[PDB]
Design a protein around this nucleic acid. Structure first.
Ligand SMILES: [Mg+2]
Ligand SMILES: [Mg+2]
Ligand SMILES: [Mg+2]
Ligand SMILES: [Mg+2]
Ligand SMILES: [Mg+2]
Ligand SMILES: [Mg+2]
Ligand SMILES: [Mg+2]
Ligand SMILES: [Mg+2]
Ligand SMILES: [Mg+2]
Ligand SMILES: [Zn+2]
Lengths: 135, 134, 136, 94, 176, 38
RNA sequence: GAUGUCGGCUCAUCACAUCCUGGGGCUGAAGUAGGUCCCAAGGGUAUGGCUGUUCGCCAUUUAAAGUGGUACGCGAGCUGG
RNA sequence: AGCCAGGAUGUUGGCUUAGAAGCAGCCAUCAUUUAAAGAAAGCGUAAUAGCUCACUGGUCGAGUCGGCCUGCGCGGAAGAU
């Protein structure tokens, strides 16, 4: 059972990692084994990405403090967040390969620049290379 | 699909691997020599775990895993058999340098992110077998 | 089985069992089993209950027995007419008035004491209630 | 801060006290100091829920007797022989 | 109560006739009629049916819940329709339909001929399968129970007439 | 069927029901748990 | 100022805490056969050896050989061990 | 409350045993990835598998849970004309 103190703690932690990160990915993860998840948690920590499953009511609270305040309409159904704190991109590509290889889920919506990205136009943050590519 | 633990340079006897994997539909002479040809680099006297993946055409493909946590703690402390009553009877001792040696080997199978995370996972296997951290 | 080691006299007048109990508080342990009824507890019932509650707590904690079967009970055998003297003592009873704390316990969590007392209560001829220690 | 509402007793004795308890109320006394003791009546449900809190027996309580406020401390309690009820409370002027 | 307060949506092509407590619900699959308990007040209005208690009746909300539930499966009945599927397990157990009669071979001396009631129809896609179809949920439910009754699933081999959605737990015979 | 004065739930799948003024224990998991008060 | 006692014979009548037959739940119920419980009182429910015996033991039956109440049913009905 | 989804890793924990891999027993009962998942509440296997729970994310959308003081009822409740 989650108390209010606990919920206020979870909103704080996901509000702190909201500001800091550059690209955030919101996706469905229903009907996928923990074996495949711990495998996306290894490939996430490696790419400098913060992975979490947060209550959609609790997300609409952490995201209200700007700039993801357009990811609201993506807080319907099971939600998993991929907050990239080290180098923009990483996740938006890590998820696309995980989605096609496992066939389950669809990937909800992506966020960057404080702007909404639809489920069809996620090719924008999927073709972006390194930082570290301009040289 | 079955999970087993066979020796580094030994795979053929009837009581441990014989009718255990042979009952499903796996070739007893094909796997026994293909396993020992790849585990030749693995040191003598160390049980190595192997997982079998079988299809409808009796064919097989195996992926070799790192030695178990309750296995490596026996050779590091200098014991053949563990304690019958753990944390009630002490059978050996292992240093902080020995804990990081088992963890660096187990890194390919461990779920942990950092060195400290994998080390604490081996600390738990030692306490539940009677071995004390010294 | 409880019983006085010696007594001034062997046999006692039937008497009556009116009034409310003395010793209505948990005075030694944390939990108690209080009598809500009126009646006689026999030395065997006292033992039956003590045994049931002890098994229940797996011989952990501490148990007190606040009652003592000091009343001798006589009985005339079969095929014996009335008179020709008072019968022979057969067993010992403790007179119980509503309010008596019968057994006390501590050193065990409430949930377990409650279960242990549920098991002991089933061996007794009188209705009982679970009681906890109070600040005055 | 525990606040108890009380009425002064218009009657005393066995008869009158038993009538109170039958009416979901209970007698109590306030004594101590230069002042005369004050025989009062309390709502059973209200004081019964209060006395469940450990603090009731340690803290200084306020008894509201017809406007006036009396600072007291729980001196003694007479509990029912087997029911979770209260028969009488001795309040000492604090 | 939570059931009674939930309105039943009467679709397009479904006729609702209310004469006091008597309700006739006509559709593409049939026509069903029910008499509601006196404690139920049924209101029509719009494309819905709403149920509620009647003043002076003690069990009004319990009654309105049942009334609701019944009228919902009546609506589903005269539209979509109901399907019960049974399956025969065991050597020699066979079934066939000849109009409105289910001939059953179930290990008895005489074959069992089960006459179907008005509104229930049956067809055998296999020699070991029975598919019932009707509008009345209670009647399809009754008929499927009666067919099962001839040979209820035994607990030692699962033999007998079972429901398709049935979990038949089997056990080992006494040891020695 | 077990007929006794004291009828109780014996497992999580046991359910207490009152059918025609008679307390009963109907159970989905174990038939041995089926009880009638009497 | 008398209410004849045990057992048998003859004749019964009720109860159900059911022996058989009927229905049914659980079973450590594969079947056959059992165990246990619920419903049920419609009918049915041995002959002999020994003993005054009731009982009981024994022999051989039977679907079964029920348990009790009726002044331990029944002597102005019989017997008299 | 129902329904959708997950219920993982070290690891088959150690000892024992022909085998004990959460699930004969005995002892310990931590640690990791975590939304959460007991070194496992029950059924199943020769041992594995397989099925489900504790726990958690989604859906739904307003109430829900069970102790106390009390009134009146229910079962417990079988007998002989
Ligand atoms: Mg008087
Ligand atoms: Mg009935
Ligand atoms: Mg005369
Ligand atoms: Mg009967
Ligand atoms: Mg019995
Ligand atoms: Mg008869
Ligand atoms: Mg016989
Ligand atoms: Mg006579
Ligand atoms: Mg004569
Ligand atoms: Zn049950």
């Amino acid at each position: 059972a989650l108390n209010l103190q606990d919920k206020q703690a979870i909103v704080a932690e996901v509000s702190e990692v909201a500001k800091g990160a550059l690209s955030a990915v919101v996706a469905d993860s229903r009907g996928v084994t923990v074996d495949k998840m711990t495998e996306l948690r290894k490939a996430g920590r490696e790419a400098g990405v913060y992975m979490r499953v947060v209550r959609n009511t609790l997300l609409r609270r952490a995201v209200e403090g700007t700039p993801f305040e357009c990811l609201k309409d993506a807080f319907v159904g099971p939600t998993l967040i991929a907050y990239v704190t080290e180098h923009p991109g990483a996740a938006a590509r890590l998820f696309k390969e995980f989605a096609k290889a496992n066939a389950k889920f669809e990937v909800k919506a992506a966020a960057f620049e404080g702007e909404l990205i639809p489920a069809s136009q996620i090719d924008r943050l999927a073709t972006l290379p390194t930082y570290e590519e301009a040289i | 699909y079955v999970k087993l633990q066979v020796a580094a340079g030994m795979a053929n006897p009837s009581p441990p691997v014989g009718p255990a994997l042979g009952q499903q539909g796996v070739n007893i002479m094909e796997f026994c020599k293909a396993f020992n040809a790849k585990t030749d680099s693995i040191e003598k006297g160390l049980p190595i775990p192997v997982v079998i993946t079988v299809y409808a055409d009796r064919s097989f493909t195996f992926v070799t895993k790192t030695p178990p946590a309750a296995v490596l703690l026996k050779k590091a402390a200098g014991i053949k058999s563990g304690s019958g009553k753990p944390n009630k009877d002490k059978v050996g001792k292992i240093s902080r340098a020995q804990l990081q040696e088992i963890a660096q080997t187990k890194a390919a199978d461990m779920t942990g992110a950092d060195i400290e995370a994998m080390t604490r996972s081996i600390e738990g296997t030692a306490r539940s077998m009677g071995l004390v951290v010294e | 089985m409880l019983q006085p080691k010696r007594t001034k006299f062997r046999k006692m007048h039937k008497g009556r069992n009116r009034g409310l109990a003395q010793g209505t508080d948990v005075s030694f342990g944390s939990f108690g089993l209080k009598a809500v009824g009126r009646g006689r507890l026999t030395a065997r019932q006292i033992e039956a209950a003590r045994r049931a509650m002890t098994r229940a707590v797996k011989r952990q904690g501490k148990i007190w027995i606040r009652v003592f079967p000091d009343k001798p009970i006589t009985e005339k055998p079969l095929a014996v007419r009335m008179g020709k003297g008072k019968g022979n003592v057969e067993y010992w009873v403790a007179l119980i008035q509503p309010g008596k704390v019968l057994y006390e316990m501590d050193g065990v969590p409430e949930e377990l004491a409650r279960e242990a007392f549920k098991l002991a209560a089933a061996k007794l001829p009188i209705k009982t209630t679970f009681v906890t220690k109070t600040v005055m | 801060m525990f606040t108890i509402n009380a009425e002064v007793r218009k009657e005393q004795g066995k008869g009158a006290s038993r009538r109170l308890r039958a009416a979901n109320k209970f007698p109590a006394i306030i004594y101590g100091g230069k002042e005369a003791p004050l025989a009062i009546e309390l709502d059973h449900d209200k004081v019964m829920n209060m006395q469940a809190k450990a603090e009731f027996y340690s803290e200084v309580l306020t008894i509201v007797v017809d406007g006036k406020e009396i600072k007291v401390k729980a001196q003694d309690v007479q509990r029912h022989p087997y029911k979770p009820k209260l028969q009488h409370i001795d309040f000492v002027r604090a | 109560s939570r059931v009674a307060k939930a309105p039943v949506v009467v679709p397009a092509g479904v006729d609702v006739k209310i004469n006091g407590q008597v309700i006739t619900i006509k559709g593409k699959n049939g026509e069903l009629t029910r008499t509601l308990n006196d404690a139920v007040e049924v209101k029509h209005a719009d494309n819905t049916l709403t149920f509620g208690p009647r003043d002076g009746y003690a069990d009004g909300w319990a009654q309105a819940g049942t009334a609701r539930a019944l009228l919902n499966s009546m609506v589903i009945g005269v539209t979509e329709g109901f399907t019960k599927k049974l399956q025969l397990v065991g050597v020699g157990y066979r079934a066939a339909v000849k109009g409105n009669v289910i001939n059953l071979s179930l290990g008895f001396s005489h074959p069992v001929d089960h006459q179907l009631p008005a509104g229930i129809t049956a067809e055998c896609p296999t020699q070991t399968e029975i598919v019932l179809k009707g509008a009345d949920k209670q009647v399809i439910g009754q008929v499927a129970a009666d067919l099962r009754a001839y040979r209820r699933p035994e607990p030692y081999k699962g033999k007998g007439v079972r429901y398709a959605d049935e979990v038949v737990r089997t056990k080992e015979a006494k040891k020695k | 069927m077990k007929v006794r004065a004291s009828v109780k739930k014996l497992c999580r799948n046991c359910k207490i029901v009152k059918r025609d003024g008679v307390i009963r224990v109907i159970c989905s998991a174990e038939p041995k748990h089926k009880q009638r008060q009497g």
